Amino acid sequence: YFKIYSKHTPINLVRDLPQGFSALEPLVDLPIGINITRFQTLLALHRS
Amino acid sequence: LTGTGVLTESNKKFLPFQQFGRDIADTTDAVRILDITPCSFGGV
């Protein structure tokens, strides 16, 4: 079963791990739960 | 899960992904929202 957890924290810190404690609650659960060996992240590139 | 107990209105809040609620030792006092409180019993 694949579980994805979503949380939002507001921090003014420029580029460091957020301070404090974070608790995450699942936005949705995927019944299929297929195994994944490797994962990549999409990045939106903004061009004038 | 069968079991006998008085249903009661619940002031507690349950998340959309939660349809069950248990206290210590997994005693069932809450359910999807309704609270489970067993009816009165004691000694004589």
Q: What is the DSSP string of A1-48?
A: -EEEEE-------SSSPPPS----EEEEEESS----S------PPP--
Q: Residue B19 to residues A23, B14, B31: CA-CA distances in angstroms?
A: 19, 7, 6
List residues of chain A with CB under 8 Å from any CB of chain B: 25-26, 29
| Long-range CB contacts for residues A17-25, cutoff 8 Å, separation at least 24 | A25/B15, A25/B17
Q: How many contacts, defined by CB atoms under 8 Å, are there between A and B?
A: 4
The reported resolution of this PDB entry, expressed in Å, is 2.5
Q: How were these coordinates obtained? A: cryo-EM
- Number of Cβ atoms within 10 Å of the Cβ of A12: 4
The three-class DSSP label of residue B25 is: helix
Residues of A in contact with B15 (CB under 8 A): 25
Nearest-Cα residue of chain B relative to residue A3: B17
Closest approach of A29 to chain B, Cα-based (Å)? 9
Residue written as token pair 């079991």: B3
Q: Which residues pair with B34 in a beta bridge?
A: B9, B31
